[PDB]
Amino acid sequence: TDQLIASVVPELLPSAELYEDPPGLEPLPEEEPLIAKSVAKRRNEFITVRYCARQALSVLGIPEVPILKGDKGQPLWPDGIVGSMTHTEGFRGAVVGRTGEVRSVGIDAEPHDVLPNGVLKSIALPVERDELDALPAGTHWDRLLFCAKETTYKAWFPLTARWLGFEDAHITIDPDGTFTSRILVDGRANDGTVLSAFDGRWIIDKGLILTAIVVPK
């Protein structure tokens, strides 16, 4: 389609995105305490991304509901639902799905610029740094890698309730618009299964990177 999230997730997962903060949005009463002490920039992205999430939820037949935050900041979806949210300068986006079709989903949006000084060494394995150098010119592969690593954590955490560091996954980026993440730590999930690899997709458009991972059921 024309929307970034829709281009990297199957249609069975409804999504919604806004590139600005429209005037007059407000949080639900239950959500107000979470941003009552927050700066305007933070308030705005929080409110707009949740308008997006509630739009995607309505497609699945779920009515207006607060989306609060858990112990590590994870969004708290209605039972039977998985989802992911992301905000950056010029993007607010959300995607959701039912657990009957997908186990987990994460998305992340970043501006298509080089990473700040020092960040790449903080987040990349030495092998990843050489792999990025072999990729074709014309794409900020360092920012794509950082984006994909965050999407890996966003997909990983609802399944494990465990931390996942940047050195704990090896992400391989294909110019294809796909990527793979190989988990280097113990990947025991909370259903008994073992999480070793994730399949990801990525797109660059409107000056943004968007990466997505769907963990199939």
Partner 1 sequence: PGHLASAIADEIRAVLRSGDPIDHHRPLETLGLDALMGLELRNRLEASLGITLPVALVWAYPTISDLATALCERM
CB 187 within 8 A of CB 160: yes
142 binds, among ligand COA, partner 1, Mn ion, none (CB under 5 to 8 A by kind): none
Asked if 15 interacts with ligand COA (CB under 6 A), we say no
Orientation angle between helical segments 126-134 and 141-160, nearest 10 degrees? 130
CA distances from 85 to 1, 15, 200 (A): 19, 10, 16
Phi and psi, residue 15, nearest 5°: -145, 165
Phi and psi, residue 208, nearest 5°: -125, 150
Is 153 labeled as ligand-binding?
Answer: yes
Single out the residue of 77, 154, 212, 214 in contact with ligand COA (rule: CB under 6 A). Answer: 154
Cross-strand pairs, 182: 170, 197
Asked if 173 interacts with ligand COA (CB under 6 A), we say no
Is 73 labeled as ligand-binding?
Answer: no
Written as six digits, the tokens of 12 are: 């069975």
DSSP 69: B
187 binds, among Mn ion, partner 1, ligand COA, none (CB under 5 to 8 A by kind): none
Q: Which amino acid would we find at residue 118?
A: G
Written as six digits, the tokens of 195 are: 């999480």
> Which range binds ligand COA by CB under 6 A, 10-18, 125-133, 158-166, 207-215?
158-166
**Between 46 and 202, CB nearer to ligand COA:** 46
Single out the residue of 5, 8, 9, 49 in contact with ligand COA (rule: CB under 6 A). Answer: 49
**Between 39 and 194, CB nearer to partner 1:** 39
- x-or-dash string of contact with partner 1, 150-169, rule CB under 8 A: x------------x-xx---
CB 68 within 8 A of CB 31: yes
85 binds, among partner 1, ligand COA, Mn ion, none (CB under 5 to 8 A by kind): ligand COA
> Which range binds ligand COA by CB under 6 A, 95-103, 112-120, 131-139, 164-172?
164-172
Residue 126 CA, distance from chain mean position: 24
Binding-site residues for CoA, please? Answer: 42, 50, 69, 72, 86-87, 108, 150, 153-154, 164-165
